[PDB]
Amino acid sequence: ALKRKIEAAKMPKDAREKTEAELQKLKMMSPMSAEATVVRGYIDWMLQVPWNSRSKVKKDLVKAQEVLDTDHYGLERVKDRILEYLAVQSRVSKIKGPILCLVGPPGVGKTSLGQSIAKATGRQYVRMALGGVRDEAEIRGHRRTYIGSMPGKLIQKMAKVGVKNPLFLLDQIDKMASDMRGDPASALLEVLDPEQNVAFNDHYLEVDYDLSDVMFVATSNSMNIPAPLLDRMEVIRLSGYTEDEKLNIAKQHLLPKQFERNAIKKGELTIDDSAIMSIIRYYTREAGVRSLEREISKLCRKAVKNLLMDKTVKHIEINGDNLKDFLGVQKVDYGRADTENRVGQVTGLAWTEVGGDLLTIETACVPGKGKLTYTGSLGEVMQESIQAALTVVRARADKLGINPDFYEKRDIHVHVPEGATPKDGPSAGIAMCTALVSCLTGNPVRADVAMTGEITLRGLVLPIGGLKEKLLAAHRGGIKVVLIPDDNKRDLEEIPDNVIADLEIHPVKRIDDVLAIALEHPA
Amino acid sequence: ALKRKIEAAKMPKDAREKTEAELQKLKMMSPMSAEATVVRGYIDWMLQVPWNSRSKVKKDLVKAQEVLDTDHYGLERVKDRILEYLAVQSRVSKIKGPILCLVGPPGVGKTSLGQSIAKATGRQYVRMALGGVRDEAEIRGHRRTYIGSMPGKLIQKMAKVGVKNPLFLLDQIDKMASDMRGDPASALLEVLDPEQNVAFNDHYLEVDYDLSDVMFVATSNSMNIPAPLLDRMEVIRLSGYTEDEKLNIAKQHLLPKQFERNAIKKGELTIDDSAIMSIIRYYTREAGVRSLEREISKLCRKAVKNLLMDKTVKHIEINGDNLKDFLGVQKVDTENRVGQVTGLAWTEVGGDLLTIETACVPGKGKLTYTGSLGEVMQESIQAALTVVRARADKLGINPDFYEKRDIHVHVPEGATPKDGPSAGIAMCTALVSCLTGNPVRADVAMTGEITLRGLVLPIGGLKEKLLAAHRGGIKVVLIPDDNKRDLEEIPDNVIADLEIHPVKRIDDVLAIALEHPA
């Protein structure tokens, strides 16, 4: 009865020898006894686990890109990765299966992207959530000595799905526990090992199980992953969304499904680009699209109750002026450029994970005793950057037309007026220097100029990180000319075309180029 | 054996096949065993988890708004949200359960509001207090290999109700300890994500469970919730109450609730309006109504005791003057001062007034800050003093005041910590006033952040600051120019009583809030 199940679900060599040796051990037992229950539990756990069953992975690349574009918008690098997997899989009968780590801010669609991938490749879909998981026996299990023992949840999900080609979605791989009491992140170090998945030995089913064709896609919010795990995964960085692609996600994906979730017919509610872009500019302040679809869903349910409570107006048209009639007061406000050329203030470009933002930097240089105060919730690298900038102004103050004993006679206060927000990094340093020169000369910084870059005591401008959201923040803010470092010219290769067309972008190499461009008068 | 309860439960395919594989496995086991006890425990949990039971929800909106208006007063944004849900629900069959986050001060009415939503939408009610939840095993549970293994506490309350659509009141989300010793806030990410509510996957019940049909209303006292949870939750801000709102809540909702709590019949106890207003002004200073039903509960049980001691009288009348006969002493309670302003402060408890005092004596330039100040407020006084040093010859100060005067900025808070940029303009007003002898006119509060060029930047928590200024006797309130868009969310009596002045820079502030022209 059982040996036809063992021969039916055909195994490899060691699993068949272990299972038939286990049944031959069961043949000399009483049927209603504890060791018979442990042996029968090991046998039917060896029978539920798939050994040879697979799934026909798709081969058409055009229809696969049609599915990937049907579910999500943008995300070209991960879609390239899936189409390249389907090309190599179209040539080779069996390959190792990719191990991917999707890393990005929340709401950018990396959990639903997994089910999009499993639909577009034909592979079956398996999800396992690792958020806050502390027990390592969720992965490997326990020995069959223990009462009520069973394999790890990976083997349970493999036995549930029935095939040896699933897509595992490892949700929150960085929010796993890692201490002395619990470390499943080092238990995943065997199952994500790209060479040793051919023999995954867990604790209940002590045979070697092959996991060298399961596609692993892990989702995390940060690089706070142990360095052995990061080295075993292929990191794809999902950056935040811009205004145009939030407009396209809203028009192409969020509005039709929120119309579908609310029984809104085609001739009841209409939302144009003015309302969508007004939600993006004045209500969200996010990197994802989740509060965006919460605002859209709020518009839809308010439209529903306004179609039920009135029942004499049967078409509601939402646009740029009547959002406050539905959504209310604008929650946020983006930074804008200044209108007049003012002595002492510059506009650096700041970048957080929410996105880029303008960064006003102001300086007062009152006559005093050389006091140096720096306020505005500054970091320590930022304050070292202001000290370096002040040293560059101080060693160059004869050329700049500055009275060289200002370090004795004048008190300098660098302030960044957001106040409650902590701010750190050397990328404001060039900006700091410019502000100081203005506040030592009365030569006002022209307000249409933003800048970014790191300063050295020689006077040189060093590269910085994250130009794309800084330039999008300057384009949103109304800046017409920015100042990037020289060795970030390569990053200009991946900027959209309207941003390059609108911004007069000047790469700089040293500080007197910046003081030549960003000041109103010659220094 | 037990298949009558399995087919009697009408389970879905994976749960039915798994529990009948477990029961079929149980029959070939010998009884009186340990693992047979484990299997009977697991079947005993899966026979009492709701798989099909669904409560019929209410389609009527007028009866619904009648219910939420009969058991609460003026929580208009939340009651609007529930009418939105019940308006969408009449057009389709099933919706994902809305995931809400009620954020407000204590006593503002967030838990009883969950009882009101439960009684009004037709759903059943159970609450899970998240205060003190320190590990994921209270959400996902343990494997049945372990000895004391139960299916978390979500599935225990789903089984405790017995329906597929309850109203979980996830109470006190911000009271969770989510450090490295245990992070249950990361386990709620699967509970609150619509991408994965159709497969919850408890550790004890490894069958995928459907949480998409459960309405999630969660309560918090602040926005200090971790950011992957803030995205999955629609936050509704509930603000504090005025005095006439507290009078209407007390007179329309709290006094009847206390009368048939302490079995006071028709004509025994009578409390007028002035006694309630004297409890509001003289025995409370909160933003909620916790202490109102505390003091009213004291009045009711002292009334019942005074009716059982002395049966000569059959009616007790309380009129604002004999509150000393019941509560005893009261608990909590003008000229133009030089170097003293009253800024507005907004804690998580609510709004509060904020006295700010300076003293510029002849010294050598020291600069001392007292009053348990945060580092951002100290930087705000440094920025404010820099604004004063920048325009010294304009304002009429001798420009040697940085080296011939020394300045003490004290807030008479005492032992309460205070932090934020929002008092900054207040600082420099006092910094003008003590350096020129021009008295600050004492009916003026002010709020706003200091820019070194002299501008006034927006502040948050405007409504609670205006409510704190309305119960403090303030008449003129100086406001940043970019918060005037919030002025159409304020109660009309607050806008009617307070005189609001939106200002753009320091010269407007000194031109309004100083007595003599500068």
């Binding site: 504890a34 326990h142 000595t145 223990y146 009462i147 023992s149 | 340990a34 290999t145 000895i147």
Partner: peptide, 7 residues
Amino acid sequence: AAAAAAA
């Protein structure tokens, strides 16, 4: 009667 180790 038979002993059995639990975790």
